[PDB]
């Protein structure tokens, strides 16, 4: 509800955050992952590796 | 039981306090060339037939 107190016409705020997820499946050896994961670091987009297949 | 069927030839705005009545001009299907002004209640397009229980009396706006 918009107002900090109770008084006023009953107006309502609907703040909506979005979260987008992506899904990559590589058939890499041990050689590449230790370079690809160490590079491609960006603010606001957090990446995790499931290196146990 | 003489009821007179008359097709409308033109609609002329709306009378009444509200737009409840529409002032329309009709041509009598029976013995045509006779054009008379008349009031309706419901929604009126053109070419629509109205059933008069009196062909005689004319129509005025509803101030």
């Amino acid at each position: 509800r918009k107002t900090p107190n109770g008084e006023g016409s009953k107006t309502w705020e609907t703040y909506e955050m979005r979260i987008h997820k992506r899904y990559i499946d590589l058939e890499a050896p041990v050689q590449i992952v230790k370079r690809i994961t160490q590079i491609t670091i960006e603010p606001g987009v957090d990446v995790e590796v499931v290196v146990a297949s | 039981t003489p009821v007179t069927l008359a097709k409308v030839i033109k609609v002329l705005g709306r009378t009444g306090s509200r737009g409840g009545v529409t002032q329309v001009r009709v041509e009598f299907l029976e013995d045509t060339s006779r054009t008379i002004v008349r009031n309706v209640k419901g929604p009126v397009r053109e070419n629509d037939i109205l059933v008069l229980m009196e062909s005689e009396r004319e129509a005025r706006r509803l101030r």
């Binding site: 016409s9 107006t11 309502w12 | -």
Partner: protein, 141 residues
């Protein structure tokens, strides 16, 4: 190397995916014959695409409809559309555009959802109401 086309028809959150293939006359819905759809009056809404053109046009095809979402009525209208759109898409691709034209203006002459979904969608609910429009009762005094 078989005539097979995967079509869909929908009415208000009701997805009906039809698979019209070269066959004999197996028209089936959720792995059951069309003759057994939940609402027994809307039996003649699911059926009308067949009665419009004729069962002779269905004497050389097999249709399998998979319905998901909506309610009972939404799902009947989805099947109806999915079957008609399936049949016209088959005739377009595997007969000719002549017989496609024929049964398109056969289907749209008798009025249609049937080929393209009713655009209508539910309006969202706004505060100070029980729906999209209907406001709560006002208390002056």
């Amino acid at each position: 190397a078989v005539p097979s086309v995967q079509t869909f028809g929908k009415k208000k959150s009701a997805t009906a995916v039809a698979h019209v293939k070269a066959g004999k006359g197996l028209i089936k819905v959720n792995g059951s014959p069309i003759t057994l759809v939940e609402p027994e009056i809307l039996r003649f809404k699911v059926y009308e695409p067949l009665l419009l053109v004729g069962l002779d046009k269905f004497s050389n095809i097999d249709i399998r409809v998979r319905v998901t979402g909506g309610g009972h009525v939404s799902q009947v209208y989805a099947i109806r559309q999915a079957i008609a759109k399936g049949l016209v898409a088959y005739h377009q691709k595997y007969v000719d555009e002549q017989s496609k034209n024929e049964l398109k203006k056969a289907f749209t002459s008798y009025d249609r959802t049937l080929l393209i979904a009713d655009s209508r969608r539910p309006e969202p609910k706004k505060f100070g109401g029980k729906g999209a429009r209907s406001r709560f009762q006002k208390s002056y005094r």
